[PDB]
Amino acid sequence: RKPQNQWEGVYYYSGITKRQRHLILLHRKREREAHMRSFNISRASVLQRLEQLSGDRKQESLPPHVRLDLAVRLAQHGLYQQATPIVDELHHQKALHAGHYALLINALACPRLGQRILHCDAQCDPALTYKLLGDENGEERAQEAYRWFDLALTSLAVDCGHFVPYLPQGTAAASHITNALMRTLLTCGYTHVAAIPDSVYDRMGSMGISPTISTYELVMLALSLQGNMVEAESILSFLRSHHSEHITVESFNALLLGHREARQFDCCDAIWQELVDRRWPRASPLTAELYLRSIMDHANTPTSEPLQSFANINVVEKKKVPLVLAQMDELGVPRTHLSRVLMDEVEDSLRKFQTYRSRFYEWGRAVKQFDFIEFRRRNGWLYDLHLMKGDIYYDDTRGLHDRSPTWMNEVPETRYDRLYGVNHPDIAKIGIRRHLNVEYVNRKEVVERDAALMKKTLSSGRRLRHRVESSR
C-alpha cells in the first residue's frame, strides 16, 4: 500500500464564513455608531447647560460650586475654551482651593472624549488613545495645563500663609497637582509627553516637591510612549529597591504598553509571566488587554530572513492564547472584560488553536477529511493565501582495549550473508545483482537462491565450454 504522510496535519475547520466576517464588521459598526451617539447627546446636554446658566443667570451671580461643577464637565467633554473664563474668575474670586485645582487639571485631560476615541477611532487600543488625543488641541490644552499649574502654586502659597521656606513645596497638595499635570500632559502631543520625564520631572526636583507612586507611573508611561525601555525599567528598578510596598498595577501596564510600542515581544512575555508569578498587585483587564494585543501584533508581524518560503512562521504565537486565557481564570481576570476588537481576534486564535476531548475523538473521521478536500476543490479561490495572487573532560589519551571480556556475554548469532562470486573472474563486478546488497527481511533466502542460480549458471556455462571444443 502507498504510505500516508505523517507530517501532514489533520484537516480541521479553523475559519469563518464570508457572511460571518461581514456580520462581525456590520455589528462592530453599529456599536461604533452607538458610542458616537452617546457622546454627542451628552456633549449637547452640557452645552445646553452652559448656555442656560449664561443666559438666564446673566446678572445673577452663581455660587462657586455650580460654576466649578460645570467647568470640569466642559473640560471632560473636550471643551476647554468654554471652561477657561470660568476658572479665571474662580481664581480671581479666590474660591478655588488645593483639591479644586487638581480636579480641574485632571478634567483637562478629557476623560469623556477619550472614551469616544477608544471605542470608535482608536479601535480599542489603549496605546492609540494617547496618540489620538494629542491631535484635538494637544498643544493648546498643554499651555492651559501649565497656566492652571501656575494658578495652583500661586494659590497654594496664599493658602499656606513652621516649615515656612519649605511651603507649599513640601505639602501633599503640591505633588497632587503635579501628578494631575503629568496626567493631562500625557493626553497631549508628542512634544509634551517627551517633556514629562525631562522637563516636568526636573522642574519638580528643582521645586523640591516629593513625588508619589502616581508620579513615577506617569513618567514610566511617558517613557513608554517614546519607546525608551532602558529608562522605563530603571524607574521600576528604583521602585523595586526602595519603595516596594506601594507599587501598583499601572507601572506594569506602562511596561506592557512600552515594549509593545518598541516591538520587543520577548520582554513583554517576561513581564506577564512575572505578574502571574507574584499575583500582587492584581491583574486588571488592562493587563490582559495590553498583553494579548502584544501577541496579536507579534502574530501578524511578517518575517524576512526566510522570506515566507512555505508559510507565515509568527502565526504559531497565537497558540499561547489558550494558555493565557487559562491563566486569567485563576488570576480572577474575567474574559468578558475584553474589548470587542480584541475578542474577535482572541476567538480567531481559539478556533485555530483549541480542541476539546469530545471533538478530538471525532475530528479525524474520513467524512470530515474528505469534506475538507472537496471544499478546497469547489471554492478554494475564496479562502487561500496562494489563490489571491570514559569522562571526556579528563580523557585525553584514551585507554584502548582494557581486556573487557566479550565472551562472558553472549552475542553469538552475528552471521552475515554476502553475495556469491565477489572475486570470480567470470562474474562481473557491476550488475543488477548489486541491488541484492540492500535487502534485510529475506537476506538469508535470497542470496542462497542467488548462489544456487550463479553456481548452476557457471556449471552450465563451463560444461558448454568443454562440449564445443571437444567436438571440433
Partner 1 sequence: RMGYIPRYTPWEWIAIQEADQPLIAEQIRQDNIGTSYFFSLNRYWRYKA
Partner 2 sequence: SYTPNLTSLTNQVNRSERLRKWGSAGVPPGVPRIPRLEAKGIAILHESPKVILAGRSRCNNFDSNQYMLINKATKRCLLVDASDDWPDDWAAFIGASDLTLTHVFLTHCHIDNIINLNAFLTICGSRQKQDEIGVMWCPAEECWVQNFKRSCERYGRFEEMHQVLPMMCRSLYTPQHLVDPVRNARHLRRNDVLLSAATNRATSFIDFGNGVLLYYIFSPGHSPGHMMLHIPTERILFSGDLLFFNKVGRVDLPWATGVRLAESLRLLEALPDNTVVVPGHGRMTTLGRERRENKALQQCYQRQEIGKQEVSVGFNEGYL
Partner 3 sequence: YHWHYNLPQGMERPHSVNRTFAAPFQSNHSLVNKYRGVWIEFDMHPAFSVALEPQLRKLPRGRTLPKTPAEEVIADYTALAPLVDDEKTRDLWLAKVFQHCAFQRCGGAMELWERYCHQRFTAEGATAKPPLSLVKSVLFYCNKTDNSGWRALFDRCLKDGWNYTPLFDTAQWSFMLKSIGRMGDEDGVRAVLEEMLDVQADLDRVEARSVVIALNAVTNADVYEFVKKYLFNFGERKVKFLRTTYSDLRGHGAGKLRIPLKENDNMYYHVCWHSSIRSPRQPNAKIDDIVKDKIEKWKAEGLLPEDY
Burial of 251: CB neighbours in 10 Å, binned 0-12, 13-18, 19+? buried
Distance CA 467, CA 461 (A): 10
146 sits near partner 3 (criterion: CB under 8 A): no
- Provide DSSP, 147-167: HHHHHHHHHHHHHT---GGGT
In whole angstroms, the minimum distance from the beta carbon of 126 to partner 2 comes to 55
Nearer to partner 2, 240 or 455 (CB): 455
The owner of cell 496562494 is 386
Decide if 75 contacts 107 (C-beta within 8 A). yes
Nearer to partner 1, 123 or 314 (CB): 314
32 sits near partner 2 (criterion: CB under 8 A): no
470 sits near partner 2 (criterion: CB under 8 A): no
CA–CA distance from 413 to each of 352, 420, 444 (Å)? 53, 21, 13
SS in 3 state form for 433-466? Answer: HHHHHCCCCCHHHHHHHHHHHHHHHHHHHHHHHH
Question: Which residue from 19, 429, 467, 472 is in contact with partner 3, where contact means CB under 8 A?
Answer: 19
Question: Which residue from 280, 356, 393, 407 is in contact with partner 1, where contact means CB under 8 A?
Answer: 356
**Other Cβ atoms closer than 10 A to 284:** 16
**Count residues contacting partner 3 (CB under 8 A)?**
28
In whole angstroms, the minimum distance from the beta carbon of 362 to partner 1 comes to 13
363 sits near partner 3 (criterion: CB under 8 A): no
Name the binder of 354 from partner 3, partner 2, partner 1, none, CB < 5-8 A by kind.
partner 1
Q: Which three cell numbers stand for residue 138?
A: 494637544
Pick out residues in 141-160 that bind partner 1 (CB under 8 A): none
Site string for partner 1, 67-106 (x = CB under 8 A): ----------------------------------------
Q: Which three cell numbers stand for residue 356?
A: 476539546
Question: Which residue from 13, 166, 190, 238 is in contact with partner 3, where contact means CB under 8 A?
Answer: 13
376 sits near partner 3 (criterion: CB under 8 A): yes
307 sits near partner 1 (criterion: CB under 8 A): no
Question: Which residue from 31, 202, 329, 439 is in contact with partner 1, where contact means CB under 8 A?
Answer: 329
16 sits near partner 3 (criterion: CB under 8 A): yes
Of the candidates 186, 244, 253, 258, the residue with the CA atom closest to the CA atom of residue 213? 244
Q: Which three cell numbers stand for residue 219?
A: 513618567
Distance CA 449, CA 417 (A): 12
Name the binder of 458 from partner 3, partner 2, partner 1, none, CB < 5-8 A by kind.
partner 2
The interface region with partner 3, picked from 5-13, 32-40, 148-156, 462-470 by CB under 8 A, is 5-13
Distance CA 187, CA 130 (A): 5
Question: Which residue from 88, 274, 329, 426 is in contact with partner 2, where contact means CB under 8 A?
Answer: 426
- Provide DSSP, 57-72: TSSSPPPHHHHHHHHH
The interface region with partner 2, picked from 56-64, 109-117, 409-417, 456-464 by CB under 8 A, is 456-464
388 sits near partner 3 (criterion: CB under 8 A): no
Give kind and range of the element (H or E) at residue 296.
helix 285-299
The interface region with partner 1, picked from 223-231, 308-316, 377-385, 417-425 by CB under 8 A, is 308-316
Question: Which residue from 323, 388, 430, 464 is in contact with partner 1, where contact means CB under 8 A?
Answer: 323
Nearer to partner 1, 228 or 354 (CB): 354
Q: Which amino acid is at 389?
A: K
Nearer to partner 2, 24 or 458 (CB): 458
If phi > 0 it is left, if psi is from -120 to 50 it is alpha, else beta; for residue 409 that is beta
Site string for partner 2, 364-403 (x = CB under 8 A): ----------------------------------------
Question: Which residue from 12, 146, 265, 372 is in contact with partner 1, where contact means CB under 8 A?
Answer: 12
Phi, psi of 241 (to 5 degrees): -85, -45
- Provide DSSP, 198-266: IIIHHHHHHHTPPP-HHHHHHHHHHHHHHT-HHHHHHHHHHHHHT--SS--HHHHHHHHHHHHHTT-HH
CA–CA distance from 311 to each of 26, 285, 382, 384 (Å)? 30, 33, 18, 12
In whole angstroms, the minimum distance from the beta carbon of 312 to partner 3 comes to 7
In whole angstroms, the minimum distance from the beta carbon of 417 to partner 3 comes to 17
Binding residues for partner 1 (CB under 8 A): 7, 9-10, 12, 14, 306, 309-313, 315-316, 319, 322-323, 326, 329-330, 352-357, 360
| Binding footprint of partner 2 on the chain (CB under 8 A) | 421, 425-433, 436, 442, 445-447, 449-450, 453-454, 456-458, 460-462, 464-465, 467-469, 471-472
